[PDB]
Paper text:
Being a multi-subunit complex, its macromolecular organization affects the dynamics of photosynthetic membranes. A chloroplast photosystem I (PSI) of green algae consists of a core complex and three antenna modules: inner belt, outer belt and Lhca2-Lhca9 heterodimer, which together comprise 24 subunits.
We used 2D classification to separate PSI dimers from monomers in a reference-free manner, followed by 3D classification leading to a subset of 14,173 particles, which were refined to an overall resolution of 2.97 Å by applying C2 symmetry. To derive a structure of the chloroplast PSI dimer, we first built an accurate model of one monomer using the 2.74 Å resolution map and then fitted it into the cryo-EM density of the C2 refined dimer. Compared with the monomer, all but two core subunits (PsaH and PsaO) and one light-harvesting protein (Lhca2) are found in the dimer. In addition, two unaccounted densities corresponding to two loops on the stromal side of Lhca9 and PsaG could be interpreted in the dimer, due to the stabilization by the adjacent monomer. As a result, the area is closely packed with PsaG, and therefore also the PsaG loop region 63–77 is better resolved in the dimer. The newly modelled β-carotene 622 is in Lhca9 and could be identified owing to structural stabilization of the interface region in the dimer. Instead, PsaH, which normally preserves a monomer, is not present, and Lhca9 with its associated co-factors acts as a symmetrical linker between the monomers, highlighting the importance of the light-harvesting antenna proteins for regulation of the macro-organization.
Residue numbers in the entry:
A (entry chain L): 53 to 142, 157 to 190
B (entry chain F): 63 to 227
C (entry chain A): 10 to 751
D (entry chain B): 516 to 588
E (entry chain D): 53 to 196
F (entry chain J): 1 to 40
G (entry chain C): 2 to 81
The structure:
Amino acid sequence: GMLETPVTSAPIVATYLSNLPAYRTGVAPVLRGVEIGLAHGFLLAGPFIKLGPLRNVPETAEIAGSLSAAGLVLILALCLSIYGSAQFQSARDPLFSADGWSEFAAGFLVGGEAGVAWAYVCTQ
Amino acid sequence: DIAGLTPCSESKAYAKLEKKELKTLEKRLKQYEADSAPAVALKATMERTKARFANYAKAGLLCGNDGLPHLIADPGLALKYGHAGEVFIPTFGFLYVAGYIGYVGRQYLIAVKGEAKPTDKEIIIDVPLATKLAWQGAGWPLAAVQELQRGTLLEKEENITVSPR
Amino acid sequence: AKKVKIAVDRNPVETSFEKWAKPGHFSRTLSKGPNTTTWIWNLHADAHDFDSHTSDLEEISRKVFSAHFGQLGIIFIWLSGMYFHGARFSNYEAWLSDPTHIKPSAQVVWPIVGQEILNGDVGGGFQGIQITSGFFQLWRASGITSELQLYTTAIGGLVMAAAMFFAGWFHYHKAAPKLEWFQNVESMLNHHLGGLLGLGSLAWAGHQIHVSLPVNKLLDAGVDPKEIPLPHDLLLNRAIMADLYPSFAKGIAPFFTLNWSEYSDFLTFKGGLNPVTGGLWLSDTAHHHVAIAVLFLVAGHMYRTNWGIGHSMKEILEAHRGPFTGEGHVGLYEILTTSWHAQLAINLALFGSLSIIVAHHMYAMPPYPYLATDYGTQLSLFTHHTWIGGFCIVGAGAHAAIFMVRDYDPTNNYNNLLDRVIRHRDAIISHLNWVCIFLGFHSFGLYIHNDTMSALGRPQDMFSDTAIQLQPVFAQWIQNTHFLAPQLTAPNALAATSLTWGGDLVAVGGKVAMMPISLGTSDFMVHHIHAFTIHVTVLILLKGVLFARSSRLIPDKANLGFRFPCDGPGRGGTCQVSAWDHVFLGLFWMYNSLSIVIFHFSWKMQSDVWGTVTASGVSHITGGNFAQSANTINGWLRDFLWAQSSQVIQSYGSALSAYGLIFLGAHFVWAFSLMFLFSGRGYWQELIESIVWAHNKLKVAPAIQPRALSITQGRAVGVAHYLLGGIATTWSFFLARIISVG
Amino acid sequence: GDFLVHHAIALGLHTTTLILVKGALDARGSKLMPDKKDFGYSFPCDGPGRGGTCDISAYDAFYLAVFWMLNTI
Amino acid sequence: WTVPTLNPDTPSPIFGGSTGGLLRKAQTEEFYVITWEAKKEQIFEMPTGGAAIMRQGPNLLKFGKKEQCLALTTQLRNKFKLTPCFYRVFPDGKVQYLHPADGVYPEKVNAGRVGANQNMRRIGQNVNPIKVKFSGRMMSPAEI
Amino acid sequence: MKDFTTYLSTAPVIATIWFTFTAGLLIEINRYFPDPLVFS
Amino acid sequence: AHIVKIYDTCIGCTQCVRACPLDVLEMVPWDGCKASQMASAPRTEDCVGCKRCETACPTDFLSVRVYLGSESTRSMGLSY
Ligand code: CLA
Ligand code: CLA
Ligand code: CLA
Ligand code: CLA
Ligand code: CLA
Ligand SMILES: CC1=C(C/C=C(\C)CCC[C@H](C)CCC[C@H](C)CCCC(C)C)C(=O)c2ccccc2C1=O
């Protein structure tokens, strides 16, 4: 069969993945979308603020960077939505279905924008 | 003169060009000894440079505003004004040699086609035959024309393979 | 316990010219003679492919052994010519008197068709082509002081060349070693470690201690070369040597009584560069070769041959067995004693990597007198030995794939290191694939980021020392550690090994020989370009080796062979799947990667190291513009290629005008090659059909049927012309530039 | 100076015409591929057999001729 | 001769495994199974890379595409003089048998086979492309 | 000796001698008649 | 699926069948040649278009011809 390896087949690694929102079955797709969106949205603000074109402005740097992070989350939400449209047109987990993914994309937008807003509040 | 050109012997720019080249050689000369090996070589170069500029002027070439010789290719203009040696005469000089080489090679190729194994006569040259054909090629224009008139120069259309059409 | 012994066969082959008159005799396919022009190319392509002519390993080994004598004989003719031309057509004797003002020259051209202008004014009342091979510096270091000494070496070189060709004939036609002889790897390593490298190093130490050191000590003192004692007078008269080095007054007793400190006067550990000549101390170099001699002589007593003591290489390999690697190194010993290609793959890899290491160490630690201040020699030697290393490494991939197709046998390799590597090749190539993509974005993307920010008028947004900074902190730490090594970690060394680490510059004849090299943002960016282009070359070559036998596209690629064009247009198209084609593609990337290496070296040296010393300070050739300009692609185009190519394009009418011609001609050959790379033989075979018709019409059609080159030969002809044109273009550009200004 | 450049232009026109004209007159077939018409204007190749047939279609003759057109212009 | 029936419980060679094996296609579209009898335990080369030991008696392997199965078949027949046969297996559980289609390898002529895609003319007797134009789809003159 | 003279008759050997001769003739002519541009 | 056609110049050498790496071709009885057998292409849905069969055919011009056509998972030679 496939080449066995500790990275591919280890107990500690398997348990960690099984607890991630993507693999945690039994949770509504919308809730998983919010949990995933919040984590990525919070991180997405970092690089824009520190290395953006308006990084050296004292107060505008925080606003401009976070506002660009919010924009990228919006674009990503569109990518999630159209992916579901193309992939699911006609199985065990509700997420991998036309109904499930549409809820998942909506949750990501709500969670992602909340994370970007929450990141801004931390700064000011 | 022809096409607005002027004889190099009467060209101001042509004369100035010779001084520039000789001046460059003279400048390098004065950093050596009188009869050292480098000095002798440089003096020899200067002699050839002076001879070259005299020969081209003596040949009656035409120089442009650049002061460099230009050649006349039209046979009528060349023979009219004595420029036959630039392009016209060398034209028939080359064709004789070019036809010589081509005719000799064609004679050898026909000669070995009659042999049992022509391919082995091409990688491994039959030197005695090649030398024989090399000397007889001096009369190629006569032999070439006689083949044309007797109709043995070209293959028949029916003996040449062609693709579907 | 097969004894190690000499074993030969008497008169294996007859010496006759019969087969000289039968081309293709070596191969069954070509022995029948030509029918199409394809036969001619096949004759030269397969001439040295011994492994395919016969299946007998013994016959293959005997041809390899004698073909190596022919290579040695050719090098001796080449070496003899270099020494001879130094004696008869050089200004070496004048150069010894005034090394800092006279340009080395050892080639003279005849006065024909006006080519005598290439005999430039080089100094010493001599006219000739300036050489960048560094032979004058090598001869001075060894102690050569007259053209007679050069002449005798050339005559000895020809005698050695004759001996090498006799040996090849003797050991193939008269006394050919048997296969069991060639397979004494333990014995060969013992002799090559202690005998070739070991005694060779000791013998050269003898020359340096007795000839080079005394002669160069007086030359540096200013003594006229003609008034220096001859090397044999130094050898016969211990009184003379005692004057230069008092340690010689005690003879060899200190060596045998272990009072080795007595020899401190000529066996030194100074470090740094000799201030008078700008090269390494020869007393340091002598102690180096004495130390290296002992290390290798000890190394040559490690393997067991006939007297029990020693190691068995098979036993070492089989003992190194771990939990993560299955069987381990089992089976490698049989692979490496029955496959010449496997041996060649290893040796080319390390021999090429060594040639690249030589280039870095020789420029940073100039080992010859007056080598450093001769910028043309420094640039040429570094660039020459980088190119040699590059080609050898690509060959290592080529002959690793040949082993994989021809000499690999699954029965002998089951669950060993070799087998397990093949069983996760997708994991290796997929990860190496991602690393290359990552390195391409984060190294070349930075240049694109800088070029766009600069064009937009946003210099503060660029990656540079005056903007967002990328400091090689790790490299800077190492430079400082080596600079302070003599204080605490190498107490008995007087100076740092190189002046690149730090300290003060050494200037010879008003020119900088070596000075500290600073690493900044531009150096950070260029280095990660090197890592990118090297990693990609590994990807291409390693992919070819791992997928030589099969892939998910061609499950039976081994049966097709090592060198085939494709498996047809099916499966979407399978052009260039063979392992030979991975060498073909790998050559382009090796050329791409080494071109940046030699551009990096050329610009960095001129900008930051090379220059003229004056009262105010050091003025460099390009005035320190590397730091601010080499962070954009536009900077390289304008400041490096466009500005420095001024010398080559203005060369006409001077002694350097030859480089101008080759600069254009190289551009031509390179573009000519794209005809073979961008086309396919289908077009050309149809074109020849119409051309053949004209010859048939005139009864002048050849008996050997014209054929368009094969698919593989089109790719081989393309890459050879592409490399020659590209490399020759840089070669002309470098020499015309550095000779003109350097 | 104009003499040399004009003759280089003629080389460009004649060579580009050669490639394009061959691509058209040989489009329907050739000795190496007598029945090329049955495959169409644009196909990859006929495989490595018969010595190799890379760039044998009439589409490929046009493809090679574009290079010479750019060079000429 | 009758069509063999595949036995899913057939033992497989001694192989550690590799990364060149089946992918997600096998679980969604199809995969291929090759079976044969081995006279003695021997080492052979896997078309996916590596070496495997064939058990004495029946052996069974699974491959991702047909060409991989027929590549192993060539190795077993030419070197080991064996007579392997392989199937096409679908995710729904259906099994399709092929090679040898009728029990005799195609290289050997056998009565009962019906010629397919045979044109009783030469290549040079095909019609011109103009005569098969506007036939509803791109059609070569050879098809008609 | 027959085989050796056969080897000298091979295409690469003949071409080397022939072009060595041809080149030498052209070089020698330009040595005694330097800079020929017009027949004159 | 590609198109594979056998023409009446076949001499029944069987080389095309041996060359095929996907068992697309087979030999069938015939009376039009000395060998009394002809090549057949019953399983063209498995053809990948390698043209190894055309490489192996001795007749001039070829007696087996492959016309690349519509692509699919099988004809594109994919294992994924
Ligand atoms: C490649 C083509 C070509 C071209 C464009 C020219 C062009 C020219 N030729 Mg040349 N010529 C050529 C080939 C060519 N020639 C060849 C192959 C030969 C035979 C070896 C000659 C022999 C020749 C002679 C003998 C003369 C010219 C002359 C001329 C000039 C005017 C007449 C002429 O030829 O008109 C255009 C050209 C053509 C239509 C092609 C055929 C030209 C024939 C062969 C010559 C015509 C001469 C003409 C009747 C002279 C009348 C007197 C004149 C002062 C008006 C003109 C510069 C005349 C001259 O020197 O004028 C100053 C002249 O006397 N040519
Ligand atoms: C005059 C002496 C002599 C003679 C008559 C023979 C005769 C023979 N040898 Mg022997 N041989 C000799 C000397 C001789 N050998 C020497 C000196 C060596 C040591 C290198 C060898 C090594 C040797 C080997 C290893 C083999 C032979 C073989 C042969 C046979 C065929 C050789 C052939 O086809 O050569 C024709 C080949 C050439 C003329 C090429 C010459 C290559 C040399 C090395 C010059 C290289 C120049 C180099 C490329 C220059 C750069 C090129 C660039 C400027 C373009 C034949 C029985 C072969 C054999 O028996 O096969 C069954 C065989 O495998 N010989
Ligand atoms: C391989 C390297 C090498 C060689 C060949 C030499 C050689 C020499 N060294 Mg040097 N040396 C070396 C390395 C070397 N050295 C190193 C690495 C060091 C650093 C430790 C030194 C340090 C050093 C010192 C300090 C001195 C020498 C000296 C000498 C000379 C005399 C040695 C002596 O007393 O020998 C004693 C005896 C022998 C070596 C045996 C000789 C055996 C002969 C050749 C046998 C001949 C037999 C034959 C059948 C007879 C001919 C018959 C025929 C005519 C018919 C000698 C020229 C001495 C000298 O004079 O310097 C100027 C000296 O003082 N060396
Ligand atoms: C120690 C070095 C070494 C040795 C001993 C060999 C030996 C061999 N190699 Mg390997 N190889 C090496 C290095 C080496 N290789 C390197 C560095 C590379 C990377 C470029 C390769 C890449 C390589 C490939 C890709 C192949 C081989 C093959 C072979 C085998 C046949 C070679 C042959 O017939 O050549 C005959 C020689 C020629 C046809 C002459 C080539 C001339 C070149 C292209 C000229 C280039 C320009 C010139 C140097 C300078 C300008 C010339 C001027 C006239 C303009 C043989 C076992 C072949 C094989 O089948 O192996 C099993 C094969 O396919 N090698
Ligand atoms: C300048 C010419 C050029 C370029 C840009 C590339 C680029 C590449 N080659 Mg190629 N290659 C070239 C010439 C070139 N090659 C030539 C002439 C040959 C023939 C010898 C090859 C042969 C060859 C081989 C055989 C291989 C490559 C590989 C690669 C890849 C290296 C790793 C990577 O992904 O880097 C990152 C990509 C880049 C640096 C490209 C430029 C990226 C820009 C600057 C930034 C991105 C733009 C941004 C998103 C904005 C887009 C906006 C737009 C959408 C509106 C990469 C795609 C290797 C590969 O695939 O490795 C995985 C590989 O195996 N090449
Ligand atoms: C130009 C070209 C050709 C045509 C090139 C050919 C046929 C090679 C020509 C070599 C020389 C010029 C011909 C043989 C010369 C003889 C040795 C005779 C010479 C006699 C004297 C003049 C020396 C291909 O065959 C080809 C194949 C595959 C991909 C690309 C291409 C490609 O681009």
